[PDB]
């Protein structure tokens, strides 16, 4: 497996979301930011969506923001819309791989377009560190590091909490192969979150 298989898999999931109404994609995005501070709600929504995708039967409604997301993925008769529920289920699984700090930071970050910039940094880290199985260093364009690039920058904490060693001077990122699974999940998360605010 390589990054190209990851992109096509995540892009295909985000493709079916483009057919959703604009208000419903914003409702999903806002309410994901709400449940991102509530791990039990994310776990319950994963189980409901996973059960509905496997069984094809009625999905028992959930309460709170998790239910607001579920409203956007079910028919009137109660069954899941597979084209819509599966990418959201994919996004919830990737967020479950992230740390609590990364989840809290993403909840603050959905409100802006800085989310887009952050996505391409993680993408660049995955491409520039290929082959993934070797420790390596990555230089980043200053245009992507924002006005203030330090340990207090939110993007710094997102990459650092994935297990990447960060510093101010170039090269800024030390790729540790043990960080592959979480970093990939963050990439997939940032991709699907960005595709919803489009």
């Amino acid at each position: 497996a390589d990054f190209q298989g990851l992109y096509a898999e995540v892009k295909a999931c985000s493709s079916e979301l483009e057919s959703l109404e604009m208000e419903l994609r914003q409702q999903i995005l806002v309410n994901i930011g709400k449940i991102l501070q509530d791990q039990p709600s994310m776990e319950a929504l994963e189980a409901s969506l996973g059960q509905g995708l496997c069984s094809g039967g009625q999905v028992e409604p959930l309460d709170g923001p998790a239910g607001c997301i579920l409203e956007c993925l079910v028919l009137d008769s109660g069954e899941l819309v597979p084209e819509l529920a599966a990418p959201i289920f994919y996004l919830l699984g990737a967020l479950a791989v992230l740390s609590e700090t990364q989840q809290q930071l993403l909840a603050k970050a959905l409100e802006t377009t800085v989310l887009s910039k952050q996505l391409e940094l993680v993408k660049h880290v995955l491409e520039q560190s290929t082959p993934w199985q070797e420790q390596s260093s990555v230089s980043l364009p200053t245009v992507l590091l924002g006005d203030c690039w330090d340990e207090k920058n939110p993007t710094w904490v997102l990459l650092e909490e994935c297990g990447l060693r960060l510093q101010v001077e170039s090269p800024q990122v030390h790729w540790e192969p043990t960080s592959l699974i979480p970093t990939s999940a963050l990439y997939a998360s940032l991709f699907l979150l960005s595709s919803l605010g489009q």
Binding site: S19, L20, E21, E23, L24, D76, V81, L84
Partner: protein, 161 residues
């Protein structure tokens, strides 16, 4: 008498209809099952009294020449209407020929068809209905989307309180 198009009696009538269908393309996907549309439309037009002319696997210039050939038929003088069935791949403003590609376009604009059959270039079909049926894509985008449904159940389509 004044609200309907006059219909000629089936006696000395020579109704003509045209079917143009492209199945195999050099660069475009094969239109599987296009023969079902050809046979179905030709049979229906025969049941409606039209002698059907069927032309297949044509370029844009081939389509243009066959349409001008169809419009110059003297049988339209003893006809009361005509049908034009076009089945192929399509673009936004035209229908694709056999050799069509995004780099090498082979497209007949639908506006060209109206020019061929209008009162200027087709005297045989003046004041007579000219029906054009187009089975072709008009773009590459999907035609459906997902939206919200009324929260209220099927019992209340329209209800006050």
């Amino acid at each position: 008498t004044q609200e309907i198009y006059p219909i000629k009696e089936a006696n000395g009538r020579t109704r003509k209809a045209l079917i143009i269908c492209n199945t195999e393309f050099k660069h475009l996907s094969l239109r599987y099952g296009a023969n079902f549309d050809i046979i179905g439309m030709k049979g229906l037009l025969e049941d409606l009294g039209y002698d059907v002319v069927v032309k297949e696997e044509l370029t844009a210039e081939g389509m243009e020449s066959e349409m001008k050939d169809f419009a110059a038929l003297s049988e339209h003088q003893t006809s009361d209407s005509t049908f034009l069935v076009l089945m192929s791949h399509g673009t936004l403003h035209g229908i694709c020929g056999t050799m069509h590609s995004e780099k090498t376009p082979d497209v007949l604009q639908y506006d060209t068809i109206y020019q061929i059959f209008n009162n200027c270039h087709c005297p045989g079909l003046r004041d007579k209905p000219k029906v054009i049926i187009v089975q072709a894509a008009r773009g590459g985008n999907s035609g459906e989307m997902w939206i919200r449904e009324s929260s209220k159940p099927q019992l209340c389509r329209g209800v006050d309180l």
